[PDB]
């Protein structure tokens, strides 16, 4: 059974630019994803000032359905970005059976961030929780701050890339990297 429980948590706050960027990234993600009649269930969740849910995990059964759902969930704005709340609300309120989650077959959590960790305590608690439950966490960084010089964006996103103690090459990716998405699927083939 090549099925698995996947959740994608996106932010559309003021730190994020035109939603066409993330929908294009999600487009390429879902395109490469093998969403068959009963395999690869992907739920899209949006966060910011709160966590909104538009679609459920088992609300679709085709690449086309999930692809349309991904570009259908457009965030018009967000007062703030709370990365820690995105991870928290995903493993409970998105990975719940009533929301279309399975019996716990390969819990994949993909989250995007720009660099705004105002509280490392909440995210570390969710991290240690998902680490004990051996959840496959993937963090993608989006660059959209224009960059008016070498301000060292590496020192801004470093806070989120340190979430995973495992190799960053299989956990931390970029929106402008399509091979990153391939790296996810190839390593998702394993049990962990």
């Amino acid at each position: 059974s090549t099925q698995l429980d996947i959740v994608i948590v996106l932010d559309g706050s003021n730190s994020i630019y035109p939603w066409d960027s993330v929908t294009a990234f999600l487009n390429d993600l879902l395109e490469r994803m093998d969403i068959g009649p009963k395999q690869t269930q992907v739920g899209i969740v949006q966060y910011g000032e709160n966590v909104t849910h538009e679609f459920n995990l088992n609300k679709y059964s085709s690449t086309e359905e999930v692809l349309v759902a991904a570009k259908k969930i457009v965030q018009r704005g967000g007062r703030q970005t709370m990365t820690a709340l995105g991870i928290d609300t995903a493993r409970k309120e998105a990975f719940t059976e009533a929301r279309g989650a399975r019996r716990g077959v390969k819990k994949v959590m993909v989250i995007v961030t720009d660099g705004e960790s105002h509280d490392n305590h909440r995210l570390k608690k969710v991290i240690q929780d998902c680490e004990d439950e051996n959840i496959q966490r993937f963090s993608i960084a989006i660059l959209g701050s224009y960059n008016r010089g070498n301000l060292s964006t590496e020192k801004f996103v470093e806070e989120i890339k340190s979430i995973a103690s495992e190799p960053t090459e299989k956990h931390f990716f970029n929106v402008s990297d399509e091979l990153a998405l391939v790296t996810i699927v190839k390593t998702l083939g394993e049990r962990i």
Binding site: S13, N14, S15, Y17, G77, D114, E116, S145, Y146
Partner: peptide, 21 residues
């Protein structure tokens, strides 16, 4: 002429100042 749409949003604020001794 019809006006355009809202411009691009602002980026995250700068890091806070160092704490006291």
């Amino acid at each position: 002429g019809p006006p355009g749409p809202p411009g691009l949003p602002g980026e995250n604020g700068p890091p806070g100042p160092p704490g006291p001794p």
